[model samples]
Target: IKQGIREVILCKDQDGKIGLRLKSIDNGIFVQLVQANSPASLVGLRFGDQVLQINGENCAGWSSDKAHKVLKQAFGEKITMTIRDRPFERTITMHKDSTGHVGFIFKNGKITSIVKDSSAARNGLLTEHNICEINGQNVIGLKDSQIADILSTSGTVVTITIMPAFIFEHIIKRMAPSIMKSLMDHTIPEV
Candidate 1:
């Protein structure tokens, strides 16, 4: 029962395939791929759509395996997804180096990898940086070709906004010890 959500009902093809690939990160399940002309594709499920519910079941916080199991269990010729577009966003400004390479690969709205010795890598482009904008233009809902188009047409210096997952992890890791001590100090009984 969410507002402004899009719902799609997809059914398996003759081969009993739903033609979808899912990716789970943190506590969210994302629609990673929807095969062309398939049930999912025809229903308009695109990459980066956060699956809010599957057939009346709340799927948030579910792991990838659990989510896949739920989908597979629904072999009744029909399944529904309550989805909301929740693409990640962030930024980075780096120069295309002498080799004309910014040296980052963005796939499915994420900075999948960064090449060593590349301008992006040298300039703090971390893996798992969710790309949100390029040169001040919002690329949240854009496809790869669109992003590529922006890159090719832009000048040497490109600015990208990204949400760095690694930095978030680092902060959590840095605070874990103190958090653990705090818990132990408060909970353990004197003996």
Candidate 2:
């Protein structure tokens, strides 16, 4: 799970929904949405998670119907889903003032709001951005309040790595391990 590969076991709800939405862009299947209070959301399933396999079946070029076929088959059973991390990772550096706050309301790493007239507002930290790290430390497994306490510890300037909740297929089309490494190196700084 640490290598960007995630394993999720989804079981259908009373509404016959596992609450996972998918979209196929140019033969690649990716997570489009995860409903709140559902199995997908319970496991922290984020948008744009590239589907690599389903029930140990290869899904490199699978369609929505194909995924549905497998999903229906595993309605009451455990659906072992294999997926990779998001594709819209963006690192932003924010400079805080005496308050030592980055000016955002977050719960469990997902930035819910960017305080107006604050650094986050001016710098472009949007809602639905999942904060992954503070400076060089990853806070993925930490509690929400712990994430807040650690944010203040960064001492004045903080470099946060975040991923967009969802993105278009343009990024999926021109994506690569090499390009991702380059993207990680680029940071948007705001004073």
Candidate 3:
């Protein structure tokens, strides 16, 4: 992450441009999916899709942290993007996800996949649903610890909404006591 940001700043040689680094790039671009009942999805984006640019600026290789700053700067603001398919490319302009989440992940091209039977899966959230918001906060490019912290704050019952890439679009819910308490109930804390 530090290396990526350093490179981004080095490329531009400007302090202001340092925040434009992206999280990850694939085939020379960033990917996207539909927003969670937000503007990005309402406009037209999908899983495996790429974000070639923002506000007419190319974002081929930027660090995740800086990339997030750029997106936040563009929230509720009009931005232009260069969307590309495998062999074809085109430019399109749209309103960024006003909710602050872009609805995508960055891992091996598409970061964390929403797993099933887990906290995210049992709620009917699929691998395709991009997580744009959590607990009314944007989590587009947040670190895992940041996200985990938010999820940890949920009540005994938590509701998670998502836009499925295919059939069976439904809001998933999870209910559980605190992990420490639950574990203590089963056995003593040996550690």
Candidate 4:
């Protein structure tokens, strides 16, 4: 199935001003390069990210040549892209109430930890939530440093979309006492 597609508009600076190189790799078309200062770079395209769709059409199982054709057709238009940050092979949103702090750290583009007594923990930001979008900008292919830059520069009230984490810990925390009781029944000899 397709996932993590977004629409990004580019103006006509040149036919290939986006300066992105796409190569057909296993299962998807991957970004090979993004020229510095180009629209592609400006829009946060990164190397090794896979292109799953372009212009709302599935670009998976396509060759590099076919990917180019689709991209050319969308020149100067609102281009829709379904991208994957390869290796991680997946795709978070968060709302900050006040400017005190978001108190979570993104390591290698994933939410690694939420500090104790911080806004993030208080707000229930899960460590499993992966950073996806920030301030209405698509951050699919951005690096941890790049994401930090965005968060640092974002004004108060930043809205981000993160892929919500599963609530396994919540369930486990609730079930612990019952689990221990059952274990005792199974392992202990009654007096």
> Mind giving the per-residue lDDT tens digits that candidate 2 earns over 58-115?
7877777787677777748677888787655667888896878778898756788889
Model 1 misses residue 65 by how many Å?
Answer: 1.0
Instruction: lDDT winner between 1 and 4, please give it.
Output: 1
Worst 10 residues of 4 by lDDT: 182-191
lDDT of 4 by residue, 1-191 (tens): 13455455554355555666677755578765555456665566654466777767787698777887777767464566767753332322344446545678876456888877765676677677655456645454455686777877777566655653342122123324333223211111112
Candidate 3: which pairs clash?
21-62, 21-63, 22-62, 22-63, 23-64, 30-51, 33-46, 35-41, 107-111, 123-172
lDDT of each: 0.65, 0.66, 0.36, 0.57
**Deviating ranges (above 4 Å) for candidate 1:** 1-3, 89-191
Off by over 4 Å in 3: 1-23, 86-191
lDDT of 3 by residue, 36-148 (tens): 43333334332334556666687677665555676666534345655543111112111213333223333311225643334333333335543334433434444456555
Worst 10 contiguous positions by lDDT, candidate 1:
182-191
Candidate that beats the other on TM-score, 1 or 4, i.e. the better one: 1
Model 4, residue 83: displacement in angstroms? Answer: 9.9
| Candidates sorted by lDDT, best first | 2, 1, 4, 3
Residue 131, candidate 3: Cα error in Å is 18
Q: What is the TM-score of each predicted model, taking all chains together?
A: 0.49, 0.52, 0.32, 0.42
- TM-score for candidate 1, residues paired by index: 0.49
Model 2: which ten-residue window has the lowest total lDDT?
182-191
List per-candidate RMSD values in Å: 15.6, 11.9, 17.1, 17.9
